[PDB]
XYZ file of C-alpha atoms in Angstrom:
132
model
C 3.255 21.132 15.434
C 4.082 22.887 11.826
C 1.823 24.381 9.939
C 0.711 23.867 6.374
C 2.028 26.843 4.575
C 0.931 26.963 0.755
C -19.846 2.490 14.386
C -17.209 4.841 12.355
C -18.346 6.836 9.383
C -17.366 10.516 8.289
C -18.588 13.560 10.017
C -19.501 14.790 6.814
C -22.290 13.721 4.141
C -20.215 12.956 0.647
C -19.938 14.600 -2.732
C -20.974 12.626 -5.308
C -18.765 12.207 -8.697
C -21.295 12.794 -11.341
C -19.199 12.785 -14.111
C -15.517 11.114 -15.345
C -13.576 13.787 -13.072
C -11.612 12.538 -10.029
C -12.228 14.860 -6.990
C -9.673 17.054 -6.580
C -8.401 20.823 -5.227
C -6.433 23.517 -6.075
C -4.045 23.552 -2.598
C -5.466 25.714 0.133
C -9.176 24.630 -0.659
C -11.057 21.996 0.191
C -11.708 21.210 3.479
C -15.318 20.909 4.523
C -16.840 23.888 6.773
C -16.769 23.007 10.826
C -17.633 26.224 12.812
C -16.356 23.744 16.062
C -12.911 23.177 14.456
C -10.125 25.547 14.159
C -7.213 26.590 12.574
C -4.829 24.355 13.448
C -7.734 21.398 12.516
C -8.242 21.853 8.732
C -6.361 19.420 7.018
C -7.365 16.001 6.311
C -8.284 13.795 3.049
C -10.977 12.815 1.119
C -11.358 8.532 0.280
C -13.490 7.375 -2.467
C -16.017 4.620 -2.214
C -18.276 2.841 -4.856
C -20.846 1.134 -3.640
C -22.540 -1.808 -6.274
C -26.451 -2.886 -5.906
C -28.277 -4.662 -7.808
C -31.880 -3.327 -9.806
C -35.260 -3.740 -10.722
C -33.859 -5.723 -13.542
C -32.042 -7.897 -11.111
C -28.797 -7.293 -12.875
C -26.120 -5.649 -10.810
C -25.238 -1.938 -10.905
C -22.289 0.340 -9.184
C -23.403 3.842 -8.055
C -21.777 6.926 -9.122
C -18.457 7.264 -6.331
C -18.927 9.296 -3.301
C -16.157 10.661 -1.823
C -15.894 11.488 1.852
C -13.969 13.542 4.062
C -11.815 12.244 7.253
C -9.855 14.762 9.490
C -5.837 14.005 8.976
C -4.688 11.081 11.420
C -8.384 9.432 11.387
C -10.613 7.479 9.201
C -9.717 4.574 7.033
C -6.743 6.203 6.538
C -5.260 7.992 10.023
C -1.850 5.745 9.963
C -1.185 7.898 6.161
C 1.113 11.110 6.429
C -0.463 13.924 5.068
C 0.402 14.143 1.320
C 0.896 10.477 0.615
C -0.198 9.259 -2.776
C -2.606 6.884 -2.478
C -5.506 5.637 -4.833
C -9.217 6.774 -3.879
C -7.366 9.325 -1.524
C -7.208 12.455 -2.069
C -5.707 15.640 0.479
C -6.843 18.897 1.668
C -5.456 21.548 3.548
C -6.494 25.263 4.885
C -3.322 27.189 4.944
C -2.079 27.196 9.041
C -3.347 24.482 8.950
C -1.208 21.872 11.781
C 0.076 18.795 10.389
C -0.882 16.775 13.179
C -3.486 13.424 13.978
C -6.778 15.233 14.797
C -7.715 12.594 17.806
C -9.486 15.584 19.008
C -11.754 15.293 16.524
C -11.840 11.564 15.379
C -14.887 9.971 13.582
C -18.192 9.748 13.616
C -20.258 7.231 15.149
C -23.874 6.718 13.096
C -25.084 4.849 16.018
C -24.597 8.253 18.093
C -24.659 11.162 15.477
C -26.189 12.379 12.345
C -23.997 13.471 9.554
C -22.678 16.998 9.654
C -24.150 18.788 5.697
C -20.859 18.834 3.809
C -20.206 22.481 2.712
C -17.253 24.815 1.487
C -16.349 27.923 1.837
C -18.101 29.837 -0.975
C -16.171 30.574 -4.122
C -14.537 26.443 -3.839
C -13.440 25.209 -6.982
C -14.671 21.518 -7.955
C -14.343 19.711 -10.961
C -16.723 18.938 -13.537
C -20.120 16.526 -12.304
C -18.914 17.749 -8.657
C -21.660 19.837 -6.675
C -21.584 20.414 -3.115
């Protein structure tokens, strides 16, 4: 009830990390646009996922990391409190978001719903190697 004042999948498409800089955002930035949610809901984390696949040459390749957004209290780190330190997790919250789990939003079932394209408010800062 406190507000911030500065199978299963993400609801959104990923942000691909094309360079050496890791994902992070200035406080107050980074929550994807979602017209179906309200100001209380605007809080969560990005989680890094890195995939591997064998190339045409038969050698195992590692692809560029992909960062996926999950609302607070949902997803692989559903039990983590806002701001908790964990490798591959970076927290974001819009001013005025409610520090409560987003049970009413949950996660996407890819069998039933396509991902929403991840879009950020105009003017959001990104590290080098990221494009939204």
